[PDB]
């Protein structure tokens, strides 16, 4: 499956002018477009090389739609201040995420259209693409307005229609990078610790896409509570890194195996120091 997602943020700054409005677009784990109201000549912009093939209409049209969205979020931020009886002096953040997950037969699998205010869920379109879930009182005001207005039907048209068709087309045009798989290159490092035991760290490097499973076992039993992991992190060149470690008794390192599962491996890897 693949996804096309847009991540939108508006942050007010009383005393320092109009709120900052930003959009970032992703295909799976790759950012390909961005807009930033603080930039000079604010314009929807390429952030992947495969998208720069699109003609000036694509960019004109996306700069129009971002600038229209920006005005809507300016009004939404002040509406929030009335809903929650907040002073106009403080800074607040409104976030929006919309996009589609498609199986690789071009068939939609889930649409998203959801919002958050000052870091908490506000309203989200449910997976039937017809009804809303409202987090609080204020969001229920928005729910009833969006129910009366038929908002879901219009937003569902985007998720079922142009989000699937443009995804499918971004995947074709960016095939070389988007439908690449890079297997992890894995190895185990050994470190003696100052009170007698050993850290074994299982590394997975240069992999794409980001999803991966890294586990340690002792004599074939998984060490689910003992393992330490780091959040998966970008290498900065389009691939990712991750590691998992365990603390083991000195002289017993060879009883432990690290196991790596990833789309780029035909079979999971088992590694042993």
């Amino acid at each position: 499956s693949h996804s096309l997602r847009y991540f939108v943020t508006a942050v007010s700054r009383p005393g320092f002018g109009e709120p900052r409005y930003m959009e970032v677009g992703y295909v799976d784990n790759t950012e390909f477009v961005r807009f930033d109201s603080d930039a000079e000549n604010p314009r929807y912009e390429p952030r992947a090389r495969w998208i720069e093939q699109e003609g000036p209409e694509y960019w004109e049209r996306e700069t129009r739609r971002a600038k229209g969205n920006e005005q809507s979020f300016r009004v939404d931020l002040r509406t929030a201040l009335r809903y929650y009886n907040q002073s106009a002096g403080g800074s607040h953040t409104l976030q929006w995420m919309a996009g589609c997950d498609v199986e690789s037969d071009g068939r939609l699998l889930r649409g998203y259209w959801q919002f958050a205010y000052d870091g908490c869920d506000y309203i989200a379109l449910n997976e039937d693409l017809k009804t809303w879930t409202a987090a609080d009182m204020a969001a229920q005001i928005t729910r009833r307005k969006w129910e009366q207005a038929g908002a879901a039907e219009r937003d569902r048209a985007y998720l079922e229609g142009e989000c699937v068709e443009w995804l499918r087309r971004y995947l074709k045009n960016g095939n070389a990078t988007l439908l690449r798989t890079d297997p992890p290159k894995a190895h185990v490092t050994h470190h003696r610790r100052p009170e007698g035991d050993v850290t074994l760290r299982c590394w997975a490097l240069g992999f794409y896409p980001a999803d991966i499973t890294l586990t340690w076992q002792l004599n074939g039993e998984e060490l689910t509570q003992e393992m330490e992991l780091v959040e998966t992190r970008p290498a900065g060149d389009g691939t990712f890194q991750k590691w998992a470690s365990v603390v083991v008794p000195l002289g017993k390192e060879q009883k432990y195996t690290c196991h790596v599962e990833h789309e780029g491996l035909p079979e999971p890897l088992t590694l042993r120091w």
């Binding site: 847009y6 959009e23 677009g25 477009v33 694509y58 049209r61 996306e62 739609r65 971002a66 229209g68 969205n69 809507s72 979020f73 009004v75 939404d76 509406t79 929030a80 929006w96 919309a98 996009g99 259209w113 919002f115 506000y122 309203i123 928005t142 307005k145 969006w146 207005a149 908002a151 219009r154 937003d155 985007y158 142009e162 989000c163 443009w166």
Partner: peptide
């Protein structure tokens, strides 16, 4: 292509 906002909160 990206989503457009049509209704205010």
């Amino acid at each position: 292509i990206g989503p457009g906002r049509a209704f205010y909160t």
